[PDB]
Amino acid sequence: RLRPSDKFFELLGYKPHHVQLAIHRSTAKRRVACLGRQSGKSEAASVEAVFELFARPGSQGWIIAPTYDQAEIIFGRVVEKVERLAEVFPATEVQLQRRRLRLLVHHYDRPVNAPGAKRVATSEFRGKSADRPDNLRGATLDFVILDEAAMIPFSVWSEAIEPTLSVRDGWALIISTPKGLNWFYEFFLMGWRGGLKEGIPNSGINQTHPDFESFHAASWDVWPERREWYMERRLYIPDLEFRQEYGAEFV
């Protein structure tokens, strides 16, 4: 049900831009964001995780990226936010295992500093890596974040993530700069209701699934004052790399 509110953002120190805000307001179980670099993907994803850990005690979630080093980015941001925020929820206590990328938020039946405090629930967030399929062994997930999803093999989604989500009817936030016409393109299109758009083949004539909602932004959509700087980089950046990483185009 509940999405993080303006009050929750204010507690966090978070001031979302327009694309971020659209993602947070979406209630879709499959949110797919095709965004250029510097889009605010990481921060937005991290706020989603923070909200679940406190607002749904006992919730479990993963952030998955192509590598552990990539996964550490969103994980690290969730850790900072959770450790700080916990201060204003006296009935919580945070436990961190940095090496195992495991974050626990223990929920109690009274303030943690009170005598007799009993643990009632534990929310859990882990960082996972697509290049380490061996550590992708089950959990019952309420939510999942896929970072740089277009670089993650579809099998990771279809075999190791989607099944453990459909159980608790959990949600997925699937984020990436595009890597051509692969599974991330397909999932994007399933949620795309913004009509015909250059860079997106079959936009405007595509069908959509009701559980899907998709978002699109070039770097210069988020940062208009950087548009000229982005364009002038084409002098030394190959065209395809430019169109994908900044244009967020499916080529």
Coordinates of C-alpha atoms in Angstrom, one line a residue:
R1 CA 0.0 0.0 0.0
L2 CA 1.9 3.0 1.4
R3 CA 4.5 4.9 -0.6
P4 CA 7.1 7.1 1.1
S5 CA 5.6 10.6 1.8
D6 CA 7.0 14.1 1.7
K7 CA 7.3 13.8 5.5
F8 CA 9.4 10.7 5.1
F9 CA 11.6 12.4 2.5
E10 CA 12.1 15.4 4.8
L11 CA 13.2 13.0 7.6
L12 CA 15.7 11.5 5.2
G13 CA 17.2 14.8 4.0
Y14 CA 16.0 13.9 0.6
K15 CA 14.7 16.3 -2.0
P16 CA 13.7 14.3 -5.1
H17 CA 13.9 15.8 -8.7
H18 CA 10.9 15.3 -11.1
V19 CA 12.0 11.9 -12.4
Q20 CA 12.8 10.6 -8.9
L21 CA 9.4 11.8 -7.7
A22 CA 7.6 10.0 -10.5
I23 CA 9.3 6.8 -9.6
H24 CA 8.4 7.2 -5.9
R25 CA 4.7 8.0 -6.7
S26 CA 4.3 4.9 -8.9
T27 CA 2.5 2.0 -7.2
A28 CA 3.5 -0.4 -10.0
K29 CA 4.9 -3.8 -8.9
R30 CA 7.3 -3.5 -11.8
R31 CA 8.9 -0.1 -12.1
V32 CA 11.5 0.1 -15.0
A33 CA 13.7 3.3 -15.3
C34 CA 15.8 3.9 -18.4
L35 CA 17.8 6.9 -17.4
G36 CA 21.1 8.5 -18.5
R37 CA 24.1 8.9 -16.2
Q38 CA 23.6 11.4 -13.3
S39 CA 19.9 10.8 -13.3
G40 CA 19.6 10.3 -9.6
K41 CA 18.9 6.5 -10.0
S42 CA 21.0 5.5 -7.0
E43 CA 19.6 7.9 -4.5
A44 CA 16.0 7.2 -5.5
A45 CA 16.6 3.4 -5.3
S46 CA 18.3 3.8 -1.9
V47 CA 15.3 5.8 -0.5
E48 CA 12.9 3.1 -1.6
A49 CA 14.9 0.5 0.4
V50 CA 15.1 2.7 3.5
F51 CA 11.4 3.2 3.5
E52 CA 10.6 -0.5 3.3
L53 CA 13.0 -1.4 6.1
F54 CA 11.3 0.9 8.6
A55 CA 7.7 1.1 7.3
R56 CA 7.3 -2.6 6.8
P57 CA 9.0 -4.3 9.8
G58 CA 10.3 -7.8 8.7
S59 CA 10.6 -6.8 5.1
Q60 CA 13.4 -8.4 3.1
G61 CA 15.0 -6.9 0.0
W62 CA 18.1 -7.2 -2.2
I63 CA 19.9 -4.8 -4.4
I64 CA 21.5 -6.7 -7.3
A65 CA 24.1 -5.2 -9.7
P66 CA 26.4 -6.8 -12.3
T67 CA 29.3 -6.8 -9.7
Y68 CA 29.7 -6.5 -5.9
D69 CA 31.6 -3.3 -6.5
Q70 CA 28.5 -1.8 -8.3
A71 CA 26.1 -3.2 -5.7
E72 CA 28.1 -1.6 -3.0
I73 CA 27.0 1.9 -4.2
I74 CA 23.3 1.7 -3.5
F75 CA 24.0 -0.6 -0.5
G76 CA 26.4 2.0 1.0
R77 CA 23.8 4.7 0.6
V78 CA 21.1 2.7 2.2
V79 CA 23.4 2.0 5.1
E80 CA 24.2 5.7 5.8
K81 CA 20.5 6.6 5.6
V82 CA 19.3 3.7 7.7
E83 CA 21.9 4.3 10.5
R84 CA 21.0 8.0 10.7
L85 CA 17.3 7.6 10.4
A86 CA 17.2 5.0 13.1
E87 CA 17.9 7.7 15.6
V88 CA 14.3 9.0 15.3
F89 CA 12.7 5.6 15.7
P90 CA 13.7 4.7 19.3
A91 CA 12.3 1.1 18.9
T92 CA 14.8 0.2 16.2
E93 CA 18.4 -0.8 16.3
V94 CA 20.7 -1.3 13.3
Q95 CA 23.1 -4.1 12.8
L96 CA 25.6 -4.1 9.9
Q97 CA 27.9 -6.8 8.4
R98 CA 29.8 -4.7 5.8
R99 CA 31.8 -7.6 4.4
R100 CA 28.7 -9.7 3.7
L101 CA 26.7 -6.7 2.5
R102 CA 24.0 -7.4 5.0
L103 CA 22.0 -4.8 6.8
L104 CA 19.6 -5.6 9.6
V105 CA 17.0 -3.3 11.2
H106 CA 15.8 -4.9 14.4
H107 CA 12.3 -3.8 15.6
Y108 CA 11.4 -3.9 19.3
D109 CA 8.2 -3.8 21.4
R110 CA 9.4 -0.7 23.2
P111 CA 12.3 1.8 22.9
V112 CA 15.5 -0.1 22.7
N113 CA 17.0 1.8 25.6
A114 CA 14.2 0.7 27.9
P115 CA 14.4 -2.3 30.2
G116 CA 12.9 -5.5 29.0
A117 CA 12.9 -4.6 25.3
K118 CA 11.9 -7.5 23.2
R119 CA 12.7 -7.9 19.5
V120 CA 9.5 -8.3 17.5
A121 CA 10.7 -8.2 13.9
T122 CA 13.9 -7.8 11.8
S123 CA 14.0 -6.1 8.4
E124 CA 16.8 -7.2 6.1
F125 CA 18.7 -5.7 3.1
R126 CA 21.5 -7.4 1.2
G127 CA 23.8 -6.5 -1.7
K128 CA 24.1 -9.2 -4.4
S129 CA 26.1 -9.6 -7.5
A130 CA 25.1 -11.1 -10.9
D131 CA 28.8 -12.3 -11.4
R132 CA 28.4 -14.4 -8.3
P133 CA 25.3 -16.6 -9.1
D134 CA 26.4 -19.0 -6.3
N135 CA 25.4 -16.5 -3.6
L136 CA 22.0 -16.1 -5.3
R137 CA 20.3 -18.7 -3.2
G138 CA 16.8 -18.1 -2.1
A139 CA 15.2 -15.6 0.2
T140 CA 11.5 -14.7 0.5
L141 CA 11.7 -11.1 -0.9
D142 CA 9.3 -8.3 -0.5
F143 CA 11.3 -6.0 -2.8
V144 CA 14.3 -6.0 -5.2
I145 CA 16.4 -3.4 -6.9
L146 CA 18.3 -4.2 -10.1
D147 CA 21.0 -1.7 -10.7
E148 CA 22.5 -1.5 -14.3
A149 CA 19.9 -4.1 -15.1
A150 CA 20.6 -4.1 -18.9
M151 CA 24.1 -5.5 -18.1
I152 CA 22.6 -8.3 -15.9
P153 CA 21.7 -11.6 -17.7
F154 CA 18.0 -12.2 -18.1
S155 CA 18.5 -15.6 -16.4
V156 CA 19.4 -13.9 -13.2
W157 CA 16.0 -12.2 -13.3
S158 CA 13.9 -15.1 -14.6
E159 CA 15.5 -17.9 -12.5
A160 CA 17.0 -16.4 -9.3
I161 CA 15.0 -13.2 -8.7
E162 CA 11.4 -13.2 -10.1
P163 CA 10.3 -16.5 -8.5
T164 CA 11.2 -15.4 -4.9
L165 CA 9.3 -12.2 -5.5
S166 CA 6.0 -13.5 -6.8
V167 CA 5.6 -15.4 -3.5
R168 CA 5.1 -12.4 -1.3
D169 CA 3.9 -10.5 -4.4
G170 CA 7.0 -8.3 -3.9
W171 CA 8.0 -5.3 -6.1
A172 CA 10.9 -4.7 -8.4
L173 CA 12.6 -1.5 -9.3
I174 CA 14.6 -2.2 -12.4
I175 CA 17.1 0.5 -13.3
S176 CA 19.7 1.0 -16.0
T177 CA 21.3 2.9 -18.8
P178 CA 20.2 0.9 -21.9
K179 CA 22.4 -1.7 -23.6
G180 CA 20.5 -2.2 -26.8
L181 CA 17.5 -4.4 -27.5
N182 CA 17.6 -7.0 -24.8
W183 CA 15.3 -8.0 -21.9
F184 CA 15.6 -4.6 -20.2
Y185 CA 14.2 -3.1 -23.4
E186 CA 11.3 -5.5 -23.4
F187 CA 10.5 -4.9 -19.7
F188 CA 10.7 -1.1 -20.3
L189 CA 8.2 -1.3 -23.2
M190 CA 5.7 -3.2 -21.1
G191 CA 5.4 -0.1 -18.8
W192 CA 5.9 2.6 -21.5
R193 CA 2.9 4.9 -21.8
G194 CA 4.7 8.1 -22.9
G195 CA 4.1 7.6 -26.6
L196 CA 6.4 7.8 -29.6
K197 CA 9.9 8.9 -28.7
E198 CA 13.2 9.0 -30.6
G199 CA 15.6 6.5 -29.2
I200 CA 12.8 4.0 -28.3
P201 CA 11.7 1.7 -31.1
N202 CA 8.0 0.7 -31.1
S203 CA 7.2 3.5 -28.7
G204 CA 3.7 4.9 -29.4
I205 CA 2.6 1.5 -30.9
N206 CA 3.6 -0.8 -28.0
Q207 CA 1.2 -2.6 -25.7
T208 CA 1.6 -2.4 -21.9
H209 CA 1.0 -4.6 -18.9
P210 CA -1.0 -3.1 -15.9
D211 CA 1.7 -4.1 -13.3
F212 CA 4.4 -2.3 -15.2
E213 CA 5.3 1.4 -15.3
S214 CA 8.3 2.8 -17.1
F215 CA 10.3 6.0 -16.9
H216 CA 12.7 7.6 -19.3
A217 CA 15.2 10.5 -19.1
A218 CA 18.3 11.6 -20.8
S219 CA 21.0 13.1 -18.6
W220 CA 20.1 16.5 -20.0
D221 CA 16.4 16.0 -19.1
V222 CA 17.5 15.9 -15.4
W223 CA 20.3 18.5 -16.0
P224 CA 19.3 20.9 -18.8
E225 CA 22.2 23.3 -17.9
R226 CA 24.6 20.4 -18.8
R227 CA 23.0 19.7 -22.2
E228 CA 25.7 21.6 -24.2
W229 CA 28.5 20.0 -22.2
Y230 CA 27.0 16.5 -23.0
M231 CA 26.7 17.3 -26.7
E232 CA 30.2 18.7 -26.9
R233 CA 31.6 15.4 -25.5
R234 CA 30.5 13.7 -28.8
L235 CA 33.8 15.0 -30.2
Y236 CA 35.6 12.2 -28.4
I237 CA 32.9 9.8 -27.2
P238 CA 31.7 7.2 -29.7
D239 CA 28.1 7.9 -31.0
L240 CA 26.6 4.7 -29.7
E241 CA 28.1 5.2 -26.2
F242 CA 26.8 8.8 -26.2
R243 CA 23.2 7.9 -27.3
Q244 CA 23.0 5.1 -24.6
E245 CA 24.8 6.6 -21.6
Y246 CA 23.4 10.2 -21.9
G247 CA 20.6 9.9 -24.4
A248 CA 19.3 6.8 -22.7
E249 CA 18.5 5.5 -26.2
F250 CA 17.8 1.9 -27.1
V251 CA 20.0 1.3 -30.2

